[PDB]
C-alpha cells in the first residue's frame, strides 16, 4: 500500500487535516493505511474512518443518481435515441462506487470485525458492513441483487441483536444503526411497514431513557432521534 511507509500516528494526524480541508478521498486513503497497520481502532479513529468513506461514497451516490435519472429519461417514450454515452458514464461512476464499497467491506472483513469484541466497536463495524452492502444494493440490478440485500440484512440484524443486549436505547451507535436499518427496510427491502415500526419503537424506547443522560449525551441522542422522526413524517 502507498501508505505502508507512513507512521500510524501520522496517518491519523493527516486524516484529521484532510477532514479540515474537505479532502475526503485523501482522508479515506490515510485511514485505510491506518487500518492496514493491523491494530484495532479507537472510537475517534473509527469515526474518522466512517467520515472519510461516507463522504467519498456520498459524492458517488449523488452522481450516480443524477446520471441514472438522465439514463432513464433517455429510455422514455418520445426521447431521441442518443448513443451509449450516458450508460457508459453511469457505469463508470457505478463501478467506482462499487470499488469503494468493496474496499470498505474488505477492511471490515480483514480484520476489523473479527478483532472487535467490545459492543461499541463490534456494532459500529457491523452497521458499517450493512451500510456499504446497502449502497451496493442501491445500484444492484437483480443477478446478485438479492444476495447483496440479504448480506446487508444479515449484518444489520447481527448488529441489532448485540446493540439491544449490550447498549442502552439512547446509545447513539444503537440509534444510528436502527435508523439505517429502517432506511434499508423502506428503500431497499420494500418493507415500509417494518421500517415504520422499527423507527417508532426505537424512538419511543429512546425517549423513555433520556432521563438517565447528561446534557451532552442528551444532545447526541436527540439529534439522531430527530432523524427517526423526520423519516416517520416522510413515510406516514
Amino acid at each position: 500500500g502507498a501508505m505502508g511507509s507512513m507512521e500510524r500516528a501520522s496517518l491519523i494526524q493527516k486524516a484529521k487535516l484532510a477532514e479540515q480541508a474537505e479532502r475526503y478521498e485523501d482522508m479515506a486513503a490515510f485511514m485505510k493505511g491506518a487500518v492496514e497497520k493491523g491494530e484495532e481502532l479507537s472510537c475517534e479513529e473509527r469515526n474518522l474512518l466512517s467520515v472519510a468513506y461516507k463522504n467519498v461514497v456520498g459524492g458517488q451516490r449523488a452522481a450516480w443518481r443524477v446520471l441514472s435519472s438522465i439514463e432513464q429519461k433517455s429510455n422514455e417514450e418520445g426521447s431521441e435515441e442518443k448513443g451509449p454515452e450516458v450508460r457508459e458514464y453511469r457505469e463508470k461512476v457505478e463501478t467506482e462506487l462499487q470499488g469503494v464499497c468493496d474496499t470498505v467491506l474488505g477492511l471490515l472483513d480483514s480484520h476489523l470485525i473479527k478483532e472487535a469484541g467490545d459492543a461499541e466497536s463490534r456494532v459500529f463495524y457491523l452497521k458499517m458492513k450493512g451500510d456499504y452492502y446497502r449502497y451496493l444494493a442501491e445500484v444492484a440490478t437483480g443477478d446478485d441483487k438479492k444476495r447483496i440485500i440479504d448480506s446487508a440484512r444479515s449484518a444489520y440484524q447481527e448488529a441489532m441483536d448485540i446493540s439491544k443486549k449490550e447498549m442502552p436505547p439512547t446509545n447513539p451507535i444503537r440509534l444510528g444503526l436502527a435508523l439505517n436499518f429502517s432506511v434499508f427496510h423502506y428503500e431497499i427491502a420494500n418493507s415500509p411497514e417494518e421500517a415504520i415500526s422499527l423507527a417508532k419503537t426505537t424512538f419511543d424506547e429512546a425517549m423513555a431513557d433520556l432521563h438517565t443522560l447528561s446534557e451532552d449525551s442528551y444532545k447526541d441522542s436527540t439529534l439522531i432521534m430527530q432523524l427517526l422522526r423526520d423519516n416517520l413524517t416522510l413515510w406516514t
Binding site: 467520515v51 461516507k54 451500510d131 444503526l177 439505517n180 439529534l223 439522531i224
Partner: peptide, 10 residues
C-alpha cells in the same frame, strides 16, 4: 429521500 445516520457517532 430518507435520512440516514451521520458518519460520526458516540
Amino acid at each position: 429521500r430518507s435520512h440516514s445516520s451521520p458518519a460520526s457517532l458516540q
